[PDB]
């Protein structure tokens, strides 16, 4: 009886390593799939950072994001904050944002775009601007890295199912 109890107590210890190996393999597989998705998203971030270096074709992308933030704001006055290399393109195409924003809504007319001296960094946001209200009460982040990071949570399941299925 004592040899049977010691045999069961000595034999019950195999499940810890037997489950730890299956947990380490399942964690290594998720670490490999997350390592592949983190490189695919790093390549998508490098393509998005390389596409933001244009000076003539990048105006409609930032103008569509500024019109998208202006359509969600619905204010008559809004301050546009962007990087130090994007205020010159919006300064020469500020009428197109008020024309495209005014042609898609009629609850408030856009009459002024205030480009302040607050420049966004180029090592955390590769392209895009931040639209906010005149009173500084509501701010809408319309950057490409925020839209890619927020869109990666919904695009990651389709790419994960289409990549491993």
């Amino acid at each position: 009886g004592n040899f049977k109890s010691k045999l069961k107590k000595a034999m019950l210890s195999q499940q810890i390593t037997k489950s730890t190996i299956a947990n380490k393999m399942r964690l290594k597989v998720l670490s490999a799939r997350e390592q592949s998705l983190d490189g695919i998203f790093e390549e998508t971030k490098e393509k998005l950072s390389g596409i933001a270096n244009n000076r003539d074709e990048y105006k409609p992308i930032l103008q569509s994001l500024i019109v998208e933030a202006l359509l969600k704001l619905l204010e008559p006055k809004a301050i546009v904050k962007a990087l130090e290399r994007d205020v010159d393109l919006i300064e020469s195409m500020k009428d197109d944002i008020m024309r495209e924003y005014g042609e898609k809504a009629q609850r408030a007319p856009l009459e002024e775009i205030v480009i302040s001296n607050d420049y966004l960094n180029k090592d955390l946001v590769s392209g895009g601007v931040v639209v906010s209200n005149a009173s500084d009460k509501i701010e809408i982040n319309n950057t490409l890295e925020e839209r890619l990071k927020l869109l990666s949570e919904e695009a990651l399941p389709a790419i994960r199912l289409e990549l491993y299925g």
Partner: protein
């Protein structure tokens, strides 16, 4: 007790040799079709979502 003294080395050999070939072929097959997801994610990032 010898089968439990010798079982402490199977946690690393059973985890390294268990899934060691799938991480390379999954990265090769994921890196092969990465241009389609990078082009779709780059095209979706340039428009409103």
């Amino acid at each position: 007790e010898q089968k439990n003294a010798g079982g402490v080395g199977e946690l690393e050999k059973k985890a390294e040799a268990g899934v060691q070939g799938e991480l390379a072929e999954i990265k090769k097959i994921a890196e092969k079709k990465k241009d389609d997801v990078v082009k779709i994610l780059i095209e979706t990032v340039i428009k409103p979502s």
